[PDB]
Design a protein around this ligand. Structure first.
Ligand SMILES: *[C@@H]1O[C@H](CO[C@@H]2O[C@@H](C)[C@@H](O)[C@@H](O)[C@@H]2O)[C@@H](O[C@@H]2O[C@H](CO)[C@@H](O)[C@H](O)[C@H]2NC(C)=O)[C@H](O)[C@H]1NC(C)=O
Ligand SMILES: *[C@@H]1O[C@H](CO[C@@H]2O[C@@H](C)[C@@H](O)[C@@H](O)[C@@H]2O)[C@@H](O[C@@H]2O[C@H](CO)[C@@H](O)[C@H](O)[C@H]2NC(C)=O)[C@H](O)[C@H]1NC(C)=O
Ligand SMILES: *[C@@H]1O[C@H](CO[C@@H]2O[C@@H](C)[C@@H](O)[C@@H](O)[C@@H]2O)[C@@H](O[C@@H]2O[C@H](CO)[C@@H](O)[C@H](O)[C@H]2NC(C)=O)[C@H](O)[C@H]1NC(C)=O
Ligand SMILES: *[C@@H]1O[C@H](CO)[C@@H](O)[C@H](O)[C@H]1NC(C)=O
Ligand SMILES: *[C@@H]1O[C@H](CO)[C@@H](O)[C@H](O)[C@H]1NC(C)=O
Ligand SMILES: *[C@@H]1O[C@H](CO)[C@@H](O)[C@H](O)[C@H]1NC(C)=O
Ligand SMILES: *[C@@H]1O[C@H](CO)[C@@H](O)[C@H](O)[C@H]1NC(C)=O
Ligand SMILES: *[C@@H]1O[C@H](CO)[C@@H](O)[C@H](O)[C@H]1NC(C)=O
Ligand SMILES: *[C@@H]1O[C@H](CO)[C@@H](O)[C@H](O)[C@H]1NC(C)=O
Ligand SMILES: *[C@@H]1O[C@H](CO)[C@@H](O)[C@H](O)[C@H]1NC(C)=O
Ligand SMILES: [Ca+2]
Ligand SMILES: [Ca+2]
Ligand SMILES: [Ca+2]
Lengths: 171, 321, 19, 321, 171, 321, 171, 19, 19
């Protein structure tokens, strides 16, 4: 993808994270597990809902459209009616298929960028209190309990409260 | 102690296409293309369609004896012809401006069939019992239920002049016919006038008809021909028929009420006690999706017809378990 | 079951977060 | 010491829509949809339109007595009819191929109205003063300004044959009429001959007309009818009228000059001394925008009509003060 | 947004920066204030001008188009004419609306990208002579006068001339 | 020691446009717009077109004497008229429903020209030698090759009635004419019946014709006129001609075979021994590109016509040497 | 571009790298030279091939379409036929030109993304064993010979193998 | 007022940088 | 010449990697 996160430096997805499109995996001494990012998933759901609803609303309702009949000396008019019907059908089939393709590409990139931005947010919070171990994972230079993890999740990580412990552990 | 950032994966096998890639398996997607119908003809917002069955528009409006069940019908939401709608004109000839009459009926929601020239009182000086074997009914020779074959009475066909004033407050569809015998002996035996003419006039209609006598190839064992004509009489206007032969007079006419959203379709499906907002010749559609690939012919409020075999929008992520 | 984590009126997230 | 990277914010309340979000307030945007017109009919590149007013195309070209102010007009940029343009054919009947004639006039930029058969010298053996109360003028009975009702003179209607050679170097539009009396007594009184006929021929036109006598419902207190015909005479070609009754002869014809970009519209607006490049039935447009939602009917160089209520393109940033 | 700067790690806009779409805020002891990046703003204006011009020029002028008249026996031809008119109107309304929507999305992403790239080039110049403070701000490990700030803005920051001083103060 | 990340640059001068920037030089790109044709008329999947040359459809089907080399042609892939296809109707008049006949021929792949009424045996009691100087051939007066001018024999034109039963298993195109002399004396001299008529009937066709005598302006030195009619006789059906004057009888007819993908084009190009899948009036196209800007008129399987001057997709990088 | 690599922090392209869209330049004491990244170039070629074939296959084929003829009393029908032909031609010209423009923009951004992601993956591999000297180039804090360079290209860079040598030379 | 910081023939940046 | 570094059926990479 354009942003290099999904199928990129985060090689695979998590079947064990059943509650959200994006989220976290934690492993401290208190244990291990997944924590879905519910706010980002809800924001993405709102965006994609708007997208699908846009596609549906731009296609206004198709009211009654039936064939017409022409006598044996109206072959030109019959063929013109046929040309009109077929041209409109060509154009609408083209528009539908191409819109779906382009929006699919945009949606995949949208999710890719969401994951990349989540990763960068955690990185900006952690600074040198943790190391980048690749595959989207960080390793803390200190003890981080479940409330420390949750403060990483909601964007209130306390860097000064662990700076000393982690620069002694970083040596 | 570790924290990792990741994304969802599930058991989905849904695949979508992009411009750069085909068959991308994704966690979540939604179909935008309706391909399911119920296979039934249904009511349109509670109003049942008019099923012509073995008859077509012509047999219905003229009163082909095979279409007698259709006579008391008064309102409908759309008109259904079948591939077997062959009973139309029984006596061979030309239905003039027939396609225009069908286009007119496509915007008619109801009508009143009424007697415009009562048989037993409008034509005292002419015979009205003319029938033919081309319009058989139950084995016997008969004729259209809405028209009257006027013939000579006691060896004479006097000049007739009959009129009707439209007091229905609605347009009135009036149909008549003109008979063209195969030879002048039939012309004289039937109408006792060899230089016959017909004149049909309204305030905005004005036509004269002259019989064209000649022997034609036999269609339904008839060498004569019969041409069929129609007009719309405006409210308060009068129609006048004047003739000294060959007039296939109107007996019943139709006071029309106009409506929107109706039409004529050809369908092989059967009527059920269902209600829909979208009817196609293959079946009814009940869907909120924007596109369908079921049929280009639609009545009501339907999705847009496209030739696509698949329109699937990705909503979730690339699925990488 | 009867409870969902997300408001998803179009079914865009399928059965995700649904209990 | 600090340095920061940031983006613009202002007081703008402009909102746009995107596919992921609606009503994004943005710092700068541009409207692409024109919705302002001046409410006036204007000249088109300096050339005023032809306003028919109470008359329609038929009353104009035939010379309905209610349309005498339109006789001296010669050039125009487009043609305007109003919802009250009802003075057309005053003697009832049918204008044959009238819609095709309007389509022909849609590409005429100017013409010369000229006397093709002068009243005082072209019909010495016929009366030329026939009038009717259906085409009244200032209380008195009158007739079309461009046609001539030829009648019997001294109890005789001799066979007439008059021709005209197109020396104008331009197409010549020629209009005539055929009169159909209600009864044979009026036919004999007006034209003496009961088996009358009219023949109109050019190098590429060829038609014969037969009177159809019958009593019609009264329209404008006339039981007779009058059918109106027209043709285009090619430069250097000759038109021949031959008759022994019922001919409504041409008196004035039109030498046509063709142009591009003109048309006929129906409008309730009023003429001002304005100039425009784009005219709609609601008003003139003065815009460089690519779209408009004012009216689908356009004359000149106009934006593309769309049903949209808003087409706003964001040019600046998401506005977060 | 896709690139996470606008309404992202730079949470708000600057009403005090009135002369450009993107720019800087400086704070040294000679004072504080805003500095619009006029060249990036000008290149963005060029791009957006090309975009608007493209939409306008693809929609070439609509020459005379009026209604037609049909007699009472030409209802089929009349209905064909209005089917043609209405189908073309449907297609053009759809085209206009969705073109505007998609290009609006792309324009917002374009500005997001420009801000992110400006931030990244400043970071690339500063290296370890400054610390990242979040919200798009840097804090110098040394003294940076107005000419030094302009050095950062024009792409001519002298890293060696402050390297020693800032690794003294960095400790 | 250093490692760098970089991208390709080359000597390409290919430029593309984007929405944000014009004339972007790129390393690699592909053209999607076909602008090259071969300038020739070629065969379509091995089958040569029908070249009418100096003749148009009318001259070909009636058998204009200038079109004799077209008499033996039996099959074709498309039909080519030129800007000089002027030899059609040689005796002036109206070809009725001519455009519909051209539209019909647009779906004919082959036919068999056959003698429907042999000259020496179908009209014993009439003269069949009528020729005209309007249809000259090699200096002498002549006539259409597929029609026969029936005239009085020994002072009499008896009432004729002739029939043909379609045993071809295919539609048969039958053409005939009706002569309208300029004066009563020519009518008498040619057909010796002043009240003449023609009747043409099938099971689904029914028309009667009456001569219209009048002096017309001279076209090709002819003051008379000749109207041309046609019909399609269904397999197994019978056509009957009945007349006592003025019938230009059929002599040869066409048993039509239908096909797909043909049409009639006008073109100035020359025929070569060349095979194509796509033919335009300017030349043949041999391309797998999706668009072309050569000509909107296409025969076969062609790219989509557009007004674009350039459609170039970038495939590589922005080129920065 | 959106991702800031092409014509961005990598100011120009390499005429000397003739065998690939993206790649590397190496400089050790074994010598100098270019190394195209063939797998990423092949992936990009696959994507762009799919894109071009998508355009081509969405356009289908234009079967026989010829003019029609109308007599002198069929001017309305003639003009309706002209309106139909001209409207369809307008729509298809607009669709073709706009699709080409939009996909051109997307293609350039796709390539920009690929270069940016290549750079970021090399940086992720090197970590502190090398310095960022701008212009997309890294400078190793140790000796890296031709197979160490191939180790960087193939994704198999051994960080612990040069960890200590480069921390010593980094001082 | 009369002087603009930017070349903006289409009015794409409104009054920004306008003096 | 006869050998290509890449599979490029539509020719979208021109003569790149072609020998
Ligand atoms: C496939 O998995 C589903 C579980 O839901 C999936 O995972 C979600 C996170 C989301 O991605 C959905 O779109 C996916 O469909 C199984 O269905 C559920 O299983 C749970 C088990 O605890 C059960 O309680 C629910 O009632 C089930 N709900 C539904 C709607 O099925 C499903 O059984 C799996 N199918 C197979 C074949 O393994
Ligand atoms: C809203 O603000 C404008 C200032 O222009 C805005 O800010 C720019 C940076 C740019 O974003 C433009 O697109 C915006 O329109 C005020 O108008 C200006 O006021 C000054 C007073 O010093 C005056 O000299 C200018 O001429 C004004 N500019 C214009 C274009 O009129 C305006 O007063 C503000 N409105 C409100 C309601 O607060
Ligand atoms: C322009 O350069 C080409 C070489 O190919 C270019 O570089 C590739 C990496 C790729 O980007 C292609 O798309 C480019 O076109 C020259 O063509 C080759 O020229 C050499 C001359 O030594 C010759 O031996 C090769 O056979 C040529 N290539 C082929 C496929 O035959 C071309 O000559 C250059 N043009 C100019 C004007 O210098
Ligand atoms: C984290 O976020 C939650 C949700 O708002 C909140 O309850 C909590 O107080 C925050 N802080 C910590 C330390 O968890
Ligand atoms: C790929 O998708 C196409 C249609 O999108 C389908 O016909 C084909 O079977 C798919 N192939 C695979 C391997 O899934
Ligand atoms: C959002 O925009 C729509 C139309 O685009 C409008 O009807 C609605 O009032 C807007 N909502 C707000 C909160 O401004
Ligand atoms: C449109 O407005 C401009 C600006 O006022 C004016 O110069 C021009 O004359 C106007 N055009 C018309 C046709 O009125
Ligand atoms: C910075 O760039 C500006 C732009 O022209 C230039 O005037 C100046 O000399 C450059 N250098 C410094 C140190 O400001
Ligand atoms: C820019 O491109 C246009 C068409 O895309 C062309 O007409 C013009 O000559 C080009 N200009 C330059 C300087 O290349
Ligand atoms: C690097 O990857 C290539 C890929 O085939 C492999 O051949 C090689 O053994 C790997 N290791 C090194 C040190 O190059
Ligand atoms: Ca009919
Ligand atoms: Ca009329
Ligand atoms: Ca004709």
């Amino acid at each position: 993808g354009l942003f290099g996160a999904i199928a990129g430096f985060i090689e695979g997805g998590w079947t064990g994270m059943i509650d959200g499109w994006y989220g976290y995996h934690h492993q401290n001494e208190q244990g291990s597990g997944y924590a879905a990012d519910q706010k980002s998933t809800q924001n993405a759901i709102n965006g994609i809902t708007n997208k699908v609803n846009t596609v549906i609303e731009k296609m206004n309702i198709q009211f009654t459209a039936v064939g017409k009949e022409f006598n044996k000396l109206e072959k030109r008019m019959e063929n013109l009616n046929k040309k009109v019907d077929d041209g409109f059908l060509d154009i609408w089939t083209y528009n539908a298929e191409l819109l779906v393709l382009l929006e699919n590409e945009r949606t995949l990139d949208f999710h890719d960028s969401n994951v990349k931005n989540l990763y960068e947010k955690v990185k900006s919070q952690l600074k040198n209190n943790a190391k980048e171990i690749g595959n989207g994972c960080f390793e803390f230079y200190h003890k981080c309990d479940n409330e420390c993890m949750e403060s990483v999740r909601n964007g209130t990580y306390d860097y000064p409260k662990y700076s000393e412990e982690s620069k002694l552990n970083r040596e | 102690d570790t924290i990792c950032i990741g994304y969802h994966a599930n058991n989905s096998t849904d695949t979508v296409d992009t411009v750069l890639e085909k068959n991308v398996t994704v966690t979540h997607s939604v179909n935008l293309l309706e391909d399911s119908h119920n296979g039934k003809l249904c009511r349109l917002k509670g109003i049942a369609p008019l099923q012509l069955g073995k008859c077509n528009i012509a047999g219905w409006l003229l009163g082909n004896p095979e279409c007698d069940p259709l006579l008391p019908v008064r309102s409908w939401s759309y008109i259904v012809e079948t591939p077997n709608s062959e009973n139309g004109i029984c006596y061979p000839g030309d239905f003039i401006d027939y396609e225009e009459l069908r286009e007119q009926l496509s915007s008619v929601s109801s009508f009143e069939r009424f007697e415009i020239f009562p048989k037993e009182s409008s034509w005292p000086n002419h015979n009205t019992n003319g029938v033919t074997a081309a319009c058989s009914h139950e084995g016997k020779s008969s004729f259209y239920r809405n028209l009257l074959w006027l013939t000579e009475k006691e060896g004479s066909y006097p000049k007739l002049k009959n009129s009707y004033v439209n007091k229905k407050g609605k347009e009135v569809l009036v149909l008549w016919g003109i008979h063209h015998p195969p030879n002048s002996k039939e012309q004289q035996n039937l109408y006792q006038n060899e230089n016959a003419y017909v004149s049909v006039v309204t305030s905005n209609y004005n036509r004269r008809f002259t019989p064209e006598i000649a022997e034609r190839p036999k269609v339904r064992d008839q060498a004569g021909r019969m041409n069929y004509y129609w007009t719309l009489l405006k409210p308060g206007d009068t129609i006048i028929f004047e003739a000294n032969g060959n007039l296939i007079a109107p007996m019943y006419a139709f006071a029309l009420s106009r409506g929107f959203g109706s039409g004529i379709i050809t369908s092989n499906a059967s009527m059920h006690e269902c209600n829909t907002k979208c009817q196609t010749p293959l079946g009814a559609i009940n869907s909120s999706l924007p596109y369908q690939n079921i049929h280009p012919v639609t009545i009501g409020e339907c999705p847009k017809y496209v030739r696509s075999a698949k329109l699937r929008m990705v909503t979730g992520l690339r699925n990488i378990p | 079951x009867p409870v969902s984590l997300y408001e998803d009126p179009l079914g865009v997230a399928g059965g995700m977060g649904v209990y």
